[PDB]
Amino acid sequence: ASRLYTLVLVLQPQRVLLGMKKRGFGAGRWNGFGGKVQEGETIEDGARRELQEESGLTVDALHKVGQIVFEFVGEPELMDVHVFCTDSIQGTPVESDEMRPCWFQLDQIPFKDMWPDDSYWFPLLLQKKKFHGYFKFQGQDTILDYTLREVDTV
Ligand SMILES: CN(C)C(=O)Cc1ccc(-c2nc(N)nc3ccccc23)cc1
């Protein structure tokens, strides 16, 4: 019982792009860009579409870097999140009524204002490592348990 979601990180040699979500699920947190995958759409095509819709950026090369399964205790549907990375983008990030993008230096990642699991796998993403993770949450702020491992193939 799961649903597909995408998560895209624009990671350049000295900075990473994150977006502050204004409303709905995850509002008030910085995260990468993404969302649900459409019927008849590949996961990578959904990731590209969502990056454009939310950041205003155009991407050509997306690299699969991780898969994270999120469970919220008491919620039947697991979130199967496919994580992607890109260093090659076109355009400038756009602020909209749904999203406020901002560039962060790699030593200034705003972990206190991100989902709490990010503190675990973001250091792997920064060291160009690929991973599989599972995080069990009680509400939106508490990690009850988790698994996280580096993989060669996502
Ligand atoms: C704006 N985005 C990226 C989405 O709407 C899809 C989505 C939403 C939330 C999460 C997510 N990210 C992280 N880092 N931690 C989470 C913890 C629990 C649930 C979702 C989480 C991933 C993709």
Side-chain angles (χ1 to χ4, degrees), residues 5 7-8 27 39 43 49 53 56-57 69-70 72-73 83 88 92 95-97 104 106 122 127 139 144:
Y5 296 87
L7 183 62
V8 180
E39 295 176 353
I43 296 165
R49 181 184 41 82
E53 285 181 20
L57 296 176
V69 175
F70 296 109
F72 285 103
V73 297
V83 192
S88 184
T92 171
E95 180 179 358
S96 62
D97 198 62
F104 291 87
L106 302 187
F122 224 90
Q127 283 175 353
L144 296 175

Side-chain angles (χ1 to χ4, degrees), residues 5-7 21 25 31-35 54 70 72 79 81 99 115 117-118 121 137:
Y5 296 87
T6 57
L7 183 62
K21 189 156 168 56
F25 184 79
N31 205 358
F33 303 95
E54 299 170 5
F70 296 109
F72 285 103
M79 292 182 70
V81 178
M99 194 65 75
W115 286 95
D117 55 287
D118 298 33
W121 58 262
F137 275 76

Side-chain angles (χ1 to χ4, degrees), residues 3-6 34-35 37-51 53-54:
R3 188 165 192 183
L4 295 167
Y5 296 87
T6 57
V37 183
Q38 299 171 341
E39 295 176 353
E41 181 181 58
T42 68
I43 296 165
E44 193 190 313
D45 286 349
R48 182 171 296 107
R49 181 184 41 82
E50 287 290 357
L51 177 72
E53 285 181 20
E54 299 170 5

Side-chain angles (χ1 to χ4, degrees), residues 7-11 16-18 32 83-86 121-122 125:
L7 183 62
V8 180
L9 285 307
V10 180
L11 176 63
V16 65
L17 187 68
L18 297 169
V83 192
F84 298 86
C85 202
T86 185
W121 58 262
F122 224 90
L125 182 118

Side-chain angles (χ1 to χ4, degrees), residues 58-63 65-74 76:
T58 303
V59 64
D60 282 354
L62 280 166
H63 302 272
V65 294
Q67 182 179 4
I68 311 160
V69 175
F70 296 109
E71 174 190 333
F72 285 103
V73 297

